Write a protein that binds this ligand. Structure first.
Ligand SMILES: CC/C=C/CCCCCCC[C@@H](O)CC(=O)N[C@H]1[C@@H](OP(=O)(O)O)O[C@H](CO[C@@H]2O[C@H](CO[C@]3(C(=O)O)C[C@@H](O)[C@@H](O)[C@@H]([C@H](O)CO)O3)[C@@H](OP(=O)(O)O)[C@H](OC(=O)C[C@@H](CCC/C=C/CCCCCC)OC(=O)CCCCCCCCCCCCC)[C@H]2NC(=O)C[C@@H](C/C=C/CCCCCCCC)OC(=O)CCCCCCCCCCC)[C@@H](O)[C@@H]1OC(=O)C[C@H](O)C/C=C/CCCCCCCC
Ligand SMILES: CC/C=C/CCCCCCC[C@@H](O)CC(=O)N[C@H]1[C@@H](OP(=O)(O)O)O[C@H](CO[C@@H]2O[C@H](CO[C@]3(C(=O)O)C[C@@H](O)[C@@H](O)[C@@H]([C@H](O)CO)O3)[C@@H](OP(=O)(O)O)[C@H](OC(=O)C[C@@H](CCC/C=C/CCCCCC)OC(=O)CCCCCCCCCCCCC)[C@H]2NC(=O)C[C@@H](C/C=C/CCCCCCCC)OC(=O)CCCCCCCCCCC)[C@@H](O)[C@@H]1OC(=O)C[C@H](O)C/C=C/CCCCCCCC
Ligand SMILES: CCCCCCCCCCCCCCCC(=O)OC[C@H](COP(=O)(O)O)OC(=O)CCCCCCCCCCCCCCC
Ligand SMILES: *C(=O)CCCCCCCCCCCCCCC
Ligand SMILES: *C(=O)CCCCCCCCCCCCCCC
Ligand SMILES: *C(=O)CCCCCCCCCCCCCCC
Ligand SMILES: *C(=O)CCCCCCCCCCCCCCC
Ligand SMILES: *C(=O)CCCCCCCCCCCCCCC
Ligand SMILES: *C(=O)CCCCCCCCCCCCCCC
Ligand SMILES: *C(=O)CCCCCCCCCCCCCCC
Ligand SMILES: *C(=O)CCCCCCCCCCCCCCC
Ligand SMILES: *C(=O)CCCCCCCCCCCCCCC
Ligand SMILES: *C(=O)CCCCCCCCCCCCCCC
Ligand SMILES: *C(=O)CCCCCCCCCCCCCCC
Lengths: 138, 138, 138, 138, 138, 138, 138, 138, 138, 138, 138
């Protein structure tokens, strides 16, 4: 598992506490919903778990030289299902926001859904660092 | 398997959440369909799976010194089929779009087919970063 | 465990004693509560502890070739719970402060809750270094 | 095997989707046919497969100390044939095109044969990147 | 253990003897007490000691296959307590001083409590190097 | 073996497909025939093959302590012949051409013999890259 | 042990013999006594010695499965005492001197106590190198 | 063995085919014969071959503890002869030529003897690259 | 042992023979005696010798499980004495000289005592290199 | 052995064939004879050969525990003689020449004796490269 | 052993043959005798030889557990003597020369004694390179 709950507007990772961050103001338009896929593309941990759990389910059939074939088939047929499952428990739902600043410049930012509802027409304050931004309501 | 579903216009990888992205506008012409081939060219994981599953199907014929020949032949004849199959499950279908911006400059971008249909003559908004672009309808 | 108690306004890590730090003054507005998530995202130590403690609970059922299946299942079903638990004991509660300096510039800083209560309207003194800040009351 | 089907004008590798590419126009003259040789020059995978399959065909003759000689001879006499065969299944047929752009500058590009026929006298559109080009008909 | 007694105003580490250090003068205001946490955040030595001492307390109960479960549980239940204890014996008490120099510039420095008492209103002499300072009374 | 058939004027390596190449014109004079020696100077693969095939031909004579001498002699007397043979199957025949460009500058290039005959007095077109050239007839 | 007797004003390390050193003059004020702590903070050699000497004192009590517990407890209870003792035999006594040069500039230097007594009001000669100084009486 | 036949005026190494080379003209004077010594100075492959072939010729004399002495002596007395012989089969015969160019500048180049005879007074054409030259007759 | 006899004015290390060195003249004042401590601070070779020689003196007392305790105690009680002795045989006696050059500049140099006596008031010649000096009498 | 016969005026190493070298003229004065010492200073190959050949000559005397002493003594007493002999077969005889060029500049070069005699008063031609020179008679 | 006979005025190392060296003239004054110490300061090869030869002289006394003590003592008591002897066979005798050039500049150089006698008042010629010099008589 990967704990991608540090991608909300209500939780800070501990490597950015006790630092300085700048402040700007803006306005909000055109929110639409979006899905977020964390983790890594080459799933390795799922493969090994699936492989062992599928292989040890193979010994219990047959006997002789027909048992080795069963365990060998079960190994790969569980290995692929491991990657099948390990990349469907790392999928959350978020929103995409288009904010227009008071400078006159427009940007958009994507952020995980929490327990506050964003609406078209509102005032937000941007807490920013070098290439990092958090958006919080009024 | 490789999870190339992060190449759509409705799914964001989690390493580009909580960042700033610029906004432009444009118009759409000349969409045509295209196929997309993910993964890597040197298939290694397919070779080993094919090899073991083909080798363990060789012991069950013959006996003596004619069993070793059977298992040795089965090993390679399954090894090549492993790469044959592992590079036909990583093939998806997408579209290629030619968008003309309001600057007066023309570009084209290629993107995976989803559940929205693009048509000739429409307004799109480009969300851009340094050498990254996502296209979404009006 | 990770000892993230060095993120308070009353405890200094020992690698920043006997050094020089600058002093500024400011005023405080708009405190709101926030949670803090320490540690690292890829939980490794939890996985091994969960795995061993789940595996050694598997031998005590069944016998023959039905014991191996039980221990193999218990191993992974404890492995995932290890990461489930090891990333819920590293979660503390803090505050977020917006301070306006006497220069005329505005910043905000996030800091762990202690035993002093911050209120809207107060005088604070910032002890600063290069990209490090501690806030302490009057 | 090497999957050199990403060298056509109808298939895009997945590492160049969702990017920006420029557009130019031109005219076509002097197409002639050409062969294309993929892969790598030092064939290693063919050698091992040929070696094992030739060696295990050696035990079945003779007995005593005249069996070792047979297996040793078969090993190398299959090893060289492995490289003989593994570099004749990576050979495709393509075309070479000489296109004159509307700038007044002339270039030529080589590309794999597909299912569309190029003729002398036609209009093509070049989709280009930094040192990458794809040619597609009108 | 970590010997953090070289963080006082009466003990010099031996890698800064026979060197040259500059001298300044100042005045002292606003001392307040503070705690100091040495060592390192990832406690490793505590984990192994706790693990072995907890594991060898497990064999003495039960017998058969119920002994392995006891030793496995004791191992982790002592492992976490090892880190619990090894990071509570590296905690000392010090003071924080705000000194105003004769230049007209203000700084503050934090230093371990010894056997001399600092008071508001006094003369101190700063012995300094590049980014190192020791404060000693008149 | 080394597959040096990518050194002709009718076969392109697959790492230079879908790229841009410049075009020039010229005239041809003074072709003379030449031999080409591929591969590498320190022959290693030939040594091991020769060594094993010569050594296993030594056991079949004599017995006692006079067999070890025979196998030891055969090993080296086959080892040197391995390098003798492995560097006589990598030798092809090509031509050397002196072409005078329309600029007024003269160069010469060497290229493997194919199935087209070059003659003194003819028109050729040079397809060029940075320090790469292919010559093809009119 | 660490031989920190090369930190006196009467002993030179052998890597700074046969070199050139500059000469200055000064005057001496305000000597006060100080302690010096050599060695390294992470004590490793003490831990192993304490561990072995404590462990081999554990076998001599009890018998059965109650001997293993005794040796395991003795190991750690001697391990910590090893670091307790190995960092109390590397502690010497020295002096701190404030010397005012004839330039008009003031410095202070710290140096191990020997067999000569420094007094307030005296003439000293500084033998100096790049960031190295030795002070010797008249 | 080392195949130093790529040092003639009639054989090209395959890493310099399909490249561009410049052309100059000159005249020839003062050819004299010279020997050429290829390979490497520290002969390693000869030592091992000589050592094994000399050692296995030692067992066939004597018996008891007088056999070990014989094999040990034979090992080194064959080892040195290995380097004696392996550096006398890498010695060829060539010529040294002094050519005066039409610029007015003089150079000389050394090249292996082939099947063409160079004479004093003749016209040669130099095919050159960066610090590489081949000389061929009219 | 360390052979620190190359620190005299009558012995040259062999890495500075056949080189060029400059010559200057001067005068000598204020010689005083000094001790020199060679070697390295972390004594390793003494520890192992002391450890083995102390450990093998432990077996000769007692028997049973009271022999292991004796050998374990002897090991460390000889280990520390090894470092005690190995750093008292690398201590020589030298002199420190203050020489005033004819330029008008003053320096001092430290050098091992030999068989010539230096006196206040004498002429010396300095043989110098880059940051190396030897002093020899008239 | 080291084959230092490539240091004559009649043998070229094969890494400097087919290159360009410049030509100068001069005159010869003051030849005197000199010895040349090749190889490397730390003789390793001689030590091992001497060691084995001396050790295997030790078993043939005595018996019991007096044989081990003999073999141990013979090992080192042959080891030193190995380096004694291996550095007396790499010693050749050469000449040193002082040549005055037609520029007006003087140099000298040292070169191995061959089969031509140099005399005072003669004309030589220098074939030169960057920091390489060969001298050959008229 | 180390062969430091390449530090004379009559023997050239073979890595500086066939190179160019400059020539100067001078005059000679004030030769005095000096000793030269080659090799390296940390003697390793002597330690092992002394250790083995001393250890194998220990078994021949006593029996039981009193033999181990004898061999252990002999090992170190021979080990130190190994370094005692291995650094007294690398000591030669040379001379130090002060030469005044015709420029008007003075230098001195140190060189091993040979079979020619240098006297006060003579003419020498310096053969020089970058930071290398050899001095030879008229
Ligand atoms: C707070 C919570 C605390 C937690 C833990 C604390 C509890 C501690 C209390 C300790 C008490 C315990 O000591 C008592 C005891 O065990 N006592 C036991 C002990 O006696 P003692 O007391 O020790 O003296 O031993 C006896 C011996 O048992 C048998 O011994 C034979 C050999 O023994 C012999 C011999 O011939 O050599 C003869 C004998 O006389 C003697 O001499 C021995 C001698 O010992 C030599 O060593 O040797 C074996 O044949 P073999 O070896 O030659 O092959 C045989 O297994 C055999 O031959 C082969 C077996 C194997 C087939 C079972 C697999 C099912 C597939 C499910 C996956 C689904 C896929 C999607 O085959 C069979 O058993 C045939 C069953 C056919 C029907 C199956 C239907 C199931 C599917 C339904 C699906 C429904 C869908 C809707 C074996 N059965 C056996 O050992 C037992 C076998 C019986 C199957 C019951 C079905 C349950 C399946 C439901 C699934 C759960 C939800 C997912 O059970 C097991 O192998 C363990 C099963 C684990 C499965 C986990 C699934 C993981 C998830 C999926 C992973 C992919 C047991 O009877 C005793 O009783 C019993 O054990 C009765 C017991 O009450 C039943 C077991 C319950 C455990 C289940 C929970 C596990 C969950 C996870 C754990 C972390
Ligand atoms: C040019 C120069 C050439 C150089 C070399 C060439 C010489 C070659 C000639 C060969 C002849 C030789 O083959 C003859 C022979 O050995 N012949 C011998 C041979 O017969 P074969 O001919 O082989 O057939 O074997 C016999 C067997 O001997 C005994 O055998 C017992 C077991 O044997 C049994 C059994 O019961 O199992 C029974 C038996 O019947 C038979 O069956 C065997 C069978 O073989 C099974 O294997 O088994 C052992 O008991 P165990 O095993 O169960 O434990 C016993 O040792 C035992 O039980 C245990 C012993 C051990 C205690 C001794 C340690 C002393 C501490 C000093 C350190 C100071 C610290 C600061 O305990 C005792 O011996 C009790 C002694 C109590 C009094 C000690 C006082 C000393 C202190 C004084 C301090 C004064 C201060 C002012 C053992 N003694 C023994 O094996 C002998 C034991 C006797 C002690 C004498 C005191 C000397 C100490 C002075 C110190 C010197 C200066 C520093 O001696 C030794 O262990 C070697 C001692 C080495 C000490 C070196 C010190 C190093 C420096 C300090 C290091 C930190 C010997 O008698 C024969 O005679 C003898 O051996 C008599 C002999 O003349 C005496 C030995 C002299 C050697 C000394 C020189 C070494 C210096 C360095 C060398 C490089
Ligand atoms: C941070 C979490 C770390 C988790 C690691 C714990 C591993 C637990 C292994 C259980 C071993 C059971 C063996 C079978 C039972 C038996 O009857 O075992 C019997 C045998 C000996 O008994 P006999 O005397 O009867 O032969 O072995 C033992 O008794 C071994 C002692 C068990 C305890 C060892 C301590 C744990 C390992 C060291 C800690 C390292 C931590 C590293 C953290 C990074
Ligand atoms: C974080 O998520 C860590 C990785 C989690 C791996 C989960 C593995 C589950 C594998 C299930 C396989 C079922 C096999 C069924 C028989 C073929
Ligand atoms: C992601 O896709 C991981 C790699 C998947 C590998 C799939 C391997 C399948 C191999 C089938 C081989 C069949 C052999 C039949 C007998 C020769
Ligand atoms: C700091 O916090 C160190 C890591 C702590 C790891 C804690 C591991 C607890 C695992 C509990 C698993 C329970 C399994 C129950 C049966 C499946
Ligand atoms: C992609 O193409 C992977 C490599 C394919 C290797 C194919 C190997 C075939 C070898 C056949 C050898 C036949 C030997 C017959 C007896 C000497
Ligand atoms: C410096 O402080 C070195 C590290 C010290 C480690 C101390 C380890 C103490 C562990 C105590 C564990 C008690 C376990 C009780 C049964 C679970
Ligand atoms: C590409 O060419 C791969 C290397 C090919 C090696 C061929 C080895 C042939 C060796 C023949 C040796 C014959 C020995 C006869 C008895 C001494
Ligand atoms: C230089 O000082 C080298 C390191 C010295 C280590 C000294 C170790 C002493 C350990 C004493 C432990 C006593 C244990 C008593 C029973 C628990
Ligand atoms: C290319 O040339 C590869 C190296 C060739 C090595 C040849 C080795 C020949 C050794 C002959 C030794 C004869 C020993 C006779 C008894 C002492
Ligand atoms: C150069 O000096 C090399 C290192 C020399 C090491 C000397 C070691 C001497 C150790 C003596 C120990 C006496 C132990 C007595 C019983 C405890
Ligand atoms: C090139 O020269 C390779 C190294 C040659 C090593 C020669 C070794 C000769 C050793 C002779 C030793 C004689 C020992 C006599 C008894 C002590
Ligand atoms: C070049 O000089 C190589 C190293 C030479 C090592 C010589 C070793 C001699 C050791 C003599 C030791 C005598 C021990 C006597 C009994 C203690």
């Amino acid at each position: 598992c990967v704990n991608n709950d540090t991608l909300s507007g209500d939780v800070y990772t501990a490597s950015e506490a006790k630092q300085v961050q700048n402040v700007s103001y803006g306005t909000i338009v055109n929110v639409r919903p979006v899905q977020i896929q964390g983790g890594d593309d080459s799933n390795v941990i799922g493969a090994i778990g699936g492989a062992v759990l599928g292989g040890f389910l193979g010994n219990t059939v047959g006997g002789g030289t027909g048992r080795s074939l069963a365990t060998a088939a079960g190994a790969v047929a569980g290995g692929v299902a491991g990657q099948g499952v390990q990349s469907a428990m790392n999928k959350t739902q978020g929103v995409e926001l288009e904010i227009r600043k008071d400078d006159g410049n427009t940007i958009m930012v994507v952020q995980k859904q929490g327990n506050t509802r964003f609406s078209p027409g509102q005032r937000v304050v941007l807490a920013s660092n070098g290439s990092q931004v958090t958006v919080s309501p009024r």
